Amino acid sequence: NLYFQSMMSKKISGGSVVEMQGDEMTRIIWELIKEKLIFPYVELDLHSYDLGIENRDATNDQVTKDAAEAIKKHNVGVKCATITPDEKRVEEFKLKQMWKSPNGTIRNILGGTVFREAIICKNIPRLVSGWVKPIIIGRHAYGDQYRATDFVVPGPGKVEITYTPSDGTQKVTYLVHNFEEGGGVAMGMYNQDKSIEDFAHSSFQMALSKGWPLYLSTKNTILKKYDGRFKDIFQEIYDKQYKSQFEAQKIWYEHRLIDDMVAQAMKSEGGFIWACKNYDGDVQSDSVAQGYGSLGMMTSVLVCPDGKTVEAEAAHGTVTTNPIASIFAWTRGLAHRAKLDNNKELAFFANALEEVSIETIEAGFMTKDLAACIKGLPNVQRSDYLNTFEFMDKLGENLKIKLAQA
Amino acid sequence: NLYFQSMMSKKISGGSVVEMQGDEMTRIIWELIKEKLIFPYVELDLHSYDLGIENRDATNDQVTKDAAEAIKKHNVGVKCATITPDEKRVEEFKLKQMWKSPNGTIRNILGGTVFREAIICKNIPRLVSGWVKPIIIGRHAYGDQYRATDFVVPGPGKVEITYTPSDGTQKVTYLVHNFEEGGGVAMGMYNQDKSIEDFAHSSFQMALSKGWPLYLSTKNTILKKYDGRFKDIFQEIYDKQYKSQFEAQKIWYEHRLIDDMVAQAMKSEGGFIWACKNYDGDVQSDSVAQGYGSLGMMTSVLVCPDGKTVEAEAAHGTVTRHYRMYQKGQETSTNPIASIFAWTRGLAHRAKLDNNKELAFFANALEEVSIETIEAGFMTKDLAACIKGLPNVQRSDYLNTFEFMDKLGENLKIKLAQ
Ligand SMILES: [K+]
Ligand SMILES: [K+]
Ligand SMILES: [Mg+2]
Ligand SMILES: [Mg+2]
């Protein structure tokens, strides 16, 4: 019967995508984006996992692990912002327990490097004067504080850390501290050579791809072994495989100590790749995003080690109405889907939604937070901005106009 | 015999001060500051320790400890920037070992909180537009990464971490990671309740002393025990001893997630106290300093739990490229302000312990002379580049190292006369 029916869609054939629905207001906006900007124009084979807090509670966090496995399988995730619950959220939402970070879980499973960068609009002023070009952070997605084991130390006693080799070689025990004073806290943490090796590769690849120098930040003067391993693995790798390519593009790779690097970034004019360790990537990406003008205006795409799988996300929720991050999580995921499938139509679509998003804002049609950034929240009146629904409609109006013209 | 001596000296009694000498170019600046700005006007009972890399090696780092012990006993330490050696430095100076950070060692011994703030000059432009009031970081000086135990995992095996209470009760053992396909790195780190409590007290005290809100940063959503312990301790203490005082003064205390916080700071207008965990304090102070216009223009004073002991330091330093020029006799234009303010701040504290109004007056006068000079248009090359951009800086725009010290010296002389 497949030969006899021509039941092929008038929409762009979008292909396979794993979606992860999120929390709060972002979940609401997500749907609006789906209904007004994506689905009218693109048919998709969506696999949908509800990662809202309330469904994670219902499925004892299993849905998160399944969402992650589905991403391994279909190669593209697009995720809405979610809650990582604290003490008070457990009470508020009558939850079973404090579900660990879903992003942590997803990233542990998938692996890779999370590339984050501002979404720049000519009329949204920067907070840092000299940043005339973008700064791209590659956040190492694995290990460190995100897969640590931390605990309270109730009283006097000795915390030790040990390593028992797989083979026969005996144990190595190291004192961490001898509490004789009272109690405190203690943690152990780790990372792994292959993950680090992958981290490096991606960073070198991004640098080459943009034509920009790369810096890795650590604090190997203090963490001589732990961070020394990062510094070493990157240097090794750069010398063997990338130095010549880099010299050919008139760019370079340097290690920097973390505190020097943040000052360097702040003093810079932009236009470099910044390889960061997990925590640092988490911390510096927010700073950089806010420095470009808005915390919400940011892309964030986990690029897996397999050179194929990708998870795009809206990284921030409501900050404490801006749909652009969510919009661009869809466009970046679809741009990548179009890459895998060699679909010129899908990639034209993704790119056009992005342009229209930015042209709309540049033309003076924007949500309240963006209008706050221009003239200060105290000075903002109703007529300066569009509400969530009105903004989405206005983007719909303009996306339709621009997709017609092709 | 003092009664018959009818003349009093021109100098001021400084009193008892511990000195920690440093490395390279910051050390040069340090002796210049002493030769030309302090000694001509102030008589000190200097207890000097040499923390230059060569003497650290000579004494197997014992001098670093003795200096720290001496600050405990005498209450005021001033520290010049030192070299924390990597492999290149081990080869260069044939060192016995790769000596640990002296600051780490000193902070671990003294404890407390390192208070960091930009040194503001009206003509040195900020990079962050909103930052019209200062930001003061309180960096917890003890533990976490700076007293950690880290190592290479050579191949497959199992890393675990265990606590063994000394009341005998029972081992806990947590598995950290079971490496299976290869190797990597692992580390253990800790902090201590009393230290966290002192950290809290100082942060709260600083906010009341300045009249500004306080914010503590952690990532307790992720590290629920380790960072929760900071969050819990600050809250308890705030609720129990400082909350009504804060409300009485239109100020507040809030815990923020570290990523939220750095962004908050970026879009803020300053005017707050930011308590940072050891690592964040190191990272964020530099970022804050650089956003006010210049990394080097920063105060850094560690305040011990006792309330009496203080260690002022030049926190950015050594400036090796200039030192190599200095060794060859070539002109440098090295910014001495950090090292000057380490002196002026250790002295102001000395003045306070001793009710010495003359010293308090001098410390403050040198500070204001430093800033008036820069504001008046006389400055080193780095600060001229902040105004004009580096490629537009001519030789006539700035003063070399010695020229600038002399200018500060004559400006100081005048101020002290009037
Ligand atoms: K450093
Ligand atoms: K967060
Ligand atoms: Mg973050
Ligand atoms: Mg630092």
PDB file of N, CA and C in Angstrom, chain B residues 65-125:
ATOM      1  N   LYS B  65      56.477  29.136  57.058  1.00  0.00           N
ATOM      2  CA  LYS B  65      55.826  28.873  58.367  1.00  0.00           C
ATOM      3  C   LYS B  65      56.222  29.800  59.487  1.00  0.00           C
ATOM      4  N   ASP B  66      57.513  30.094  59.621  1.00  0.00           N
ATOM      5  CA  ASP B  66      57.942  30.914  60.790  1.00  0.00           C
ATOM      6  C   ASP B  66      57.349  32.319  60.676  1.00  0.00           C
ATOM      7  N   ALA B  67      57.348  32.849  59.446  1.00  0.00           N
ATOM      8  CA  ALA B  67      56.704  34.117  59.123  1.00  0.00           C
ATOM      9  C   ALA B  67      55.225  34.140  59.488  1.00  0.00           C
ATOM     10  N   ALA B  68      54.538  33.054  59.201  1.00  0.00           N
ATOM     11  CA  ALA B  68      53.141  32.963  59.544  1.00  0.00           C
ATOM     12  C   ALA B  68      52.950  32.961  61.090  1.00  0.00           C
ATOM     13  N   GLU B  69      53.725  32.109  61.770  1.00  0.00           N
ATOM     14  CA  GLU B  69      53.770  32.087  63.243  1.00  0.00           C
ATOM     15  C   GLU B  69      54.033  33.447  63.825  1.00  0.00           C
ATOM     16  N   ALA B  70      54.943  34.176  63.202  1.00  0.00           N
ATOM     17  CA  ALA B  70      55.283  35.537  63.673  1.00  0.00           C
ATOM     18  C   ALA B  70      54.162  36.545  63.541  1.00  0.00           C
ATOM     19  N   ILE B  71      53.316  36.378  62.547  1.00  0.00           N
ATOM     20  CA  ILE B  71      52.189  37.257  62.374  1.00  0.00           C
ATOM     21  C   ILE B  71      51.227  36.959  63.495  1.00  0.00           C
ATOM     22  N   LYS B  72      51.038  35.689  63.810  1.00  0.00           N
ATOM     23  CA  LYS B  72      50.160  35.310  64.941  1.00  0.00           C
ATOM     24  C   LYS B  72      50.552  36.035  66.215  1.00  0.00           C
ATOM     25  N   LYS B  73      51.850  36.133  66.450  1.00  0.00           N
ATOM     26  CA  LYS B  73      52.398  36.674  67.687  1.00  0.00           C
ATOM     27  C   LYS B  73      52.433  38.211  67.722  1.00  0.00           C
ATOM     28  N   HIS B  74      52.724  38.842  66.577  1.00  0.00           N
ATOM     29  CA  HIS B  74      52.851  40.314  66.450  1.00  0.00           C
ATOM     30  C   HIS B  74      51.677  41.052  65.854  1.00  0.00           C
ATOM     31  N   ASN B  75      50.726  40.327  65.285  1.00  0.00           N
ATOM     32  CA  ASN B  75      49.418  40.833  64.841  1.00  0.00           C
ATOM     33  C   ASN B  75      49.320  41.564  63.492  1.00  0.00           C
ATOM     34  N   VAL B  76      50.442  41.958  62.865  1.00  0.00           N
ATOM     35  CA  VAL B  76      50.444  42.666  61.588  1.00  0.00           C
ATOM     36  C   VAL B  76      51.478  42.106  60.637  1.00  0.00           C
ATOM     37  N   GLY B  77      51.021  41.601  59.520  1.00  0.00           N
ATOM     38  CA  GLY B  77      51.918  41.141  58.512  1.00  0.00           C
ATOM     39  C   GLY B  77      51.727  41.872  57.209  1.00  0.00           C
ATOM     40  N   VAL B  78      52.810  42.248  56.561  1.00  0.00           N
ATOM     41  CA  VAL B  78      52.741  42.758  55.194  1.00  0.00           C
ATOM     42  C   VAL B  78      53.495  41.814  54.278  1.00  0.00           C
ATOM     43  N   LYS B  79      52.836  41.385  53.222  1.00  0.00           N
ATOM     44  CA  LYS B  79      53.415  40.442  52.301  1.00  0.00           C
ATOM     45  C   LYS B  79      53.531  40.857  50.843  1.00  0.00           C
ATOM     46  N   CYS B  80      54.735  40.739  50.318  1.00  0.00           N
ATOM     47  CA  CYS B  80      55.061  40.987  48.913  1.00  0.00           C
ATOM     48  C   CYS B  80      54.705  39.765  48.069  1.00  0.00           C
ATOM     49  N   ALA B  81      54.330  39.963  46.839  1.00  0.00           N
ATOM     50  CA  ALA B  81      54.027  38.865  45.959  1.00  0.00           C
ATOM     51  C   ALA B  81      55.171  37.864  45.750  1.00  0.00           C
ATOM     52  N   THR B  82      54.854  36.596  45.811  1.00  0.00           N
ATOM     53  CA  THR B  82      55.839  35.576  45.661  1.00  0.00           C
ATOM     54  C   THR B  82      55.589  34.654  44.468  1.00  0.00           C
ATOM     55  N   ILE B  83      56.572  33.860  44.130  1.00  0.00           N
ATOM     56  CA  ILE B  83      56.432  32.886  43.091  1.00  0.00           C
ATOM     57  C   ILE B  83      55.981  31.555  43.676  1.00  0.00           C
ATOM     58  N   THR B  84      54.923  30.996  43.146  1.00  0.00           N
ATOM     59  CA  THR B  84      54.531  29.660  43.501  1.00  0.00           C
ATOM     60  C   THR B  84      55.116  28.896  42.337  1.00  0.00           C
ATOM     61  N   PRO B  85      56.120  28.078  42.572  1.00  0.00           N
ATOM     62  CA  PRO B  85      56.816  27.372  41.478  1.00  0.00           C
ATOM     63  C   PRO B  85      56.115  26.196  40.818  1.00  0.00           C
ATOM     64  N   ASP B  86      56.181  26.197  39.487  1.00  0.00           N
ATOM     65  CA  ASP B  86      55.868  25.037  38.600  1.00  0.00           C
ATOM     66  C   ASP B  86      57.201  24.363  38.171  1.00  0.00           C
ATOM     67  N   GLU B  87      57.135  23.430  37.224  1.00  0.00           N
ATOM     68  CA  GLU B  87      58.343  22.743  36.705  1.00  0.00           C
ATOM     69  C   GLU B  87      59.418  23.680  36.105  1.00  0.00           C
ATOM     70  N   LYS B  88      59.047  24.663  35.296  1.00  0.00           N
ATOM     71  CA  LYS B  88      60.014  25.629  34.787  1.00  0.00           C
ATOM     72  C   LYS B  88      60.809  26.319  35.884  1.00  0.00           C
ATOM     73  N   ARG B  89      60.172  26.588  37.009  1.00  0.00           N
ATOM     74  CA  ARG B  89      60.853  27.215  38.110  1.00  0.00           C
ATOM     75  C   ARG B  89      61.693  26.235  38.876  1.00  0.00           C
ATOM     76  N   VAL B  90      61.325  24.976  38.890  1.00  0.00           N
ATOM     77  CA  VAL B  90      62.140  23.992  39.527  1.00  0.00           C
ATOM     78  C   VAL B  90      63.449  23.845  38.753  1.00  0.00           C
ATOM     79  N   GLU B  91      63.381  23.779  37.442  1.00  0.00           N
ATOM     80  CA  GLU B  91      64.578  23.721  36.594  1.00  0.00           C
ATOM     81  C   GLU B  91      65.415  25.003  36.697  1.00  0.00           C
ATOM     82  N   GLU B  92      64.787  26.141  36.487  1.00  0.00           N
ATOM     83  CA  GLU B  92      65.453  27.432  36.555  1.00  0.00           C
ATOM     84  C   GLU B  92      66.319  27.673  37.760  1.00  0.00           C
ATOM     85  N   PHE B  93      65.788  27.467  38.944  1.00  0.00           N
ATOM     86  CA  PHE B  93      66.528  27.730  40.148  1.00  0.00           C
ATOM     87  C   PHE B  93      67.045  26.504  40.856  1.00  0.00           C
ATOM     88  N   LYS B  94      67.120  25.353  40.178  1.00  0.00           N
ATOM     89  CA  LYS B  94      67.372  23.975  40.759  1.00  0.00           C
ATOM     90  C   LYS B  94      66.833  23.866  42.183  1.00  0.00           C
ATOM     91  N   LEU B  95      65.528  23.800  42.309  1.00  0.00           N
ATOM     92  CA  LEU B  95      64.904  23.748  43.594  1.00  0.00           C
ATOM     93  C   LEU B  95      64.844  22.336  44.068  1.00  0.00           C
ATOM     94  N   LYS B  96      64.813  22.144  45.368  1.00  0.00           N
ATOM     95  CA  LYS B  96      64.775  20.815  45.925  1.00  0.00           C
ATOM     96  C   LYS B  96      63.451  20.154  45.641  1.00  0.00           C
ATOM     97  N   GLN B  97      62.383  20.856  45.948  1.00  0.00           N
ATOM     98  CA  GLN B  97      61.054  20.396  45.694  1.00  0.00           C
ATOM     99  C   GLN B  97      60.267  21.465  44.996  1.00  0.00           C
ATOM    100  N   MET B  98      59.078  21.128  44.536  1.00  0.00           N
ATOM    101  CA  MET B  98      58.199  22.099  43.935  1.00  0.00           C
ATOM    102  C   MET B  98      57.359  22.663  45.047  1.00  0.00           C
ATOM    103  N   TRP B  99      57.929  23.570  45.802  1.00  0.00           N
ATOM    104  CA  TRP B  99      57.265  24.142  46.928  1.00  0.00           C
ATOM    105  C   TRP B  99      55.872  24.669  46.719  1.00  0.00           C
ATOM    106  N   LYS B 100      55.000  24.239  47.598  1.00  0.00           N
ATOM    107  CA  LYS B 100      53.635  24.686  47.680  1.00  0.00           C
ATOM    108  C   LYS B 100      53.478  26.207  47.842  1.00  0.00           C
ATOM    109  N   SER B 101      52.354  26.713  47.411  1.00  0.00           N
ATOM    110  CA  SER B 101      52.018  28.107  47.578  1.00  0.00           C
ATOM    111  C   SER B 101      52.187  28.626  49.005  1.00  0.00           C
ATOM    112  N   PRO B 102      53.023  29.624  49.156  1.00  0.00           N
ATOM    113  CA  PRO B 102      53.312  30.256  50.427  1.00  0.00           C
ATOM    114  C   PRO B 102      52.069  30.903  50.993  1.00  0.00           C
ATOM    115  N   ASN B 103      51.210  31.425  50.150  1.00  0.00           N
ATOM    116  CA  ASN B 103      49.985  32.033  50.566  1.00  0.00           C
ATOM    117  C   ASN B 103      49.092  30.986  51.125  1.00  0.00           C
ATOM    118  N   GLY B 104      49.049  29.855  50.465  1.00  0.00           N
ATOM    119  CA  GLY B 104      48.293  28.737  50.939  1.00  0.00           C
ATOM    120  C   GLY B 104      48.721  28.354  52.326  1.00  0.00           C
ATOM    121  N   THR B 105      50.014  28.212  52.510  1.00  0.00           N
ATOM    122  CA  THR B 105      50.598  27.883  53.766  1.00  0.00           C
ATOM    123  C   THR B 105      50.296  28.928  54.826  1.00  0.00           C
ATOM    124  N   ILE B 106      50.384  30.194  54.504  1.00  0.00           N
ATOM    125  CA  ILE B 106      50.128  31.233  55.467  1.00  0.00           C
ATOM    126  C   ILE B 106      48.669  31.360  55.858  1.00  0.00           C
ATOM    127  N   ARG B 107      47.782  31.183  54.910  1.00  0.00           N
ATOM    128  CA  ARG B 107      46.375  31.274  55.149  1.00  0.00           C
ATOM    129  C   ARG B 107      45.868  30.082  55.933  1.00  0.00           C
ATOM    130  N   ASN B 108      46.474  28.944  55.729  1.00  0.00           N
ATOM    131  CA  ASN B 108      46.100  27.758  56.431  1.00  0.00           C
ATOM    132  C   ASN B 108      46.468  27.868  57.892  1.00  0.00           C
ATOM    133  N   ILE B 109      47.584  28.505  58.174  1.00  0.00           N
ATOM    134  CA  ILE B 109      48.026  28.711  59.525  1.00  0.00           C
ATOM    135  C   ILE B 109      47.242  29.800  60.228  1.00  0.00           C
ATOM    136  N   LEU B 110      47.047  30.930  59.588  1.00  0.00           N
ATOM    137  CA  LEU B 110      46.346  32.011  60.225  1.00  0.00           C
ATOM    138  C   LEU B 110      44.870  31.904  60.177  1.00  0.00           C
ATOM    139  N   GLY B 111      44.342  31.400  59.086  1.00  0.00           N
ATOM    140  CA  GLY B 111      42.916  31.319  58.904  1.00  0.00           C
ATOM    141  C   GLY B 111      42.225  32.642  58.668  1.00  0.00           C
ATOM    142  N   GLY B 112      40.923  32.608  58.547  1.00  0.00           N
ATOM    143  CA  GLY B 112      40.176  33.856  58.466  1.00  0.00           C
ATOM    144  C   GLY B 112      39.584  34.085  57.079  1.00  0.00           C
ATOM    145  N   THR B 113      39.445  35.371  56.725  1.00  0.00           N
ATOM    146  CA  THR B 113      38.851  35.804  55.490  1.00  0.00           C
ATOM    147  C   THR B 113      39.695  36.879  54.839  1.00  0.00           C
ATOM    148  N   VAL B 114      39.908  36.744  53.540  1.00  0.00           N
ATOM    149  CA  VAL B 114      40.651  37.723  52.777  1.00  0.00           C
ATOM    150  C   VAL B 114      39.686  38.663  52.119  1.00  0.00           C
ATOM    151  N   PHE B 115      39.740  39.923  52.499  1.00  0.00           N
ATOM    152  CA  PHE B 115      38.852  40.950  51.996  1.00  0.00           C
ATOM    153  C   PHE B 115      39.485  41.655  50.809  1.00  0.00           C
ATOM    154  N   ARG B 116      38.814  41.615  49.675  1.00  0.00           N
ATOM    155  CA  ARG B 116      39.317  42.189  48.451  1.00  0.00           C
ATOM    156  C   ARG B 116      38.396  43.209  47.838  1.00  0.00           C
ATOM    157  N   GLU B 117      38.962  44.282  47.360  1.00  0.00           N
ATOM    158  CA  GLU B 117      38.200  45.387  46.837  1.00  0.00           C
ATOM    159  C   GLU B 117      39.106  46.099  45.815  1.00  0.00           C
ATOM    160  N   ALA B 118      38.504  46.665  44.771  1.00  0.00           N
ATOM    161  CA  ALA B 118      39.254  47.502  43.818  1.00  0.00           C
ATOM    162  C   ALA B 118      39.816  48.773  44.501  1.00  0.00           C
ATOM    163  N   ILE B 119      40.903  49.294  43.962  1.00  0.00           N
ATOM    164  CA  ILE B 119      41.447  50.612  44.318  1.00  0.00           C
ATOM    165  C   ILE B 119      41.040  51.535  43.187  1.00  0.00           C
ATOM    166  N   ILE B 120      40.085  52.427  43.464  1.00  0.00           N
ATOM    167  CA  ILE B 120      39.452  53.267  42.455  1.00  0.00           C
ATOM    168  C   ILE B 120      40.120  54.634  42.231  1.00  0.00           C
ATOM    169  N   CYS B 121      40.379  54.931  40.956  1.00  0.00           N
ATOM    170  CA  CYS B 121      40.841  56.239  40.526  1.00  0.00           C
ATOM    171  C   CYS B 121      39.832  56.798  39.541  1.00  0.00           C
ATOM    172  N   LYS B 122      39.351  58.021  39.783  1.00  0.00           N
ATOM    173  CA  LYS B 122      38.341  58.688  38.962  1.00  0.00           C
ATOM    174  C   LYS B 122      38.611  58.758  37.487  1.00  0.00           C
ATOM    175  N   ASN B 123      39.872  58.741  37.047  1.00  0.00           N
ATOM    176  CA  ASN B 123      40.207  58.798  35.599  1.00  0.00           C
ATOM    177  C   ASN B 123      40.561  57.438  34.961  1.00  0.00           C
ATOM    178  N   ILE B 124      40.505  56.359  35.730  1.00  0.00           N
ATOM    179  CA  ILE B 124      40.775  55.038  35.203  1.00  0.00           C
ATOM    180  C   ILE B 124      39.423  54.396  34.896  1.00  0.00           C
ATOM    181  N   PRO B 125      39.121  54.195  33.609  1.00  0.00           N
ATOM    182  CA  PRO B 125      37.761  53.733  33.332  1.00  0.00           C
ATOM    183  C   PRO B 125      37.489  52.258  33.692  1.00  0.00           C
TER     184      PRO B 125
END
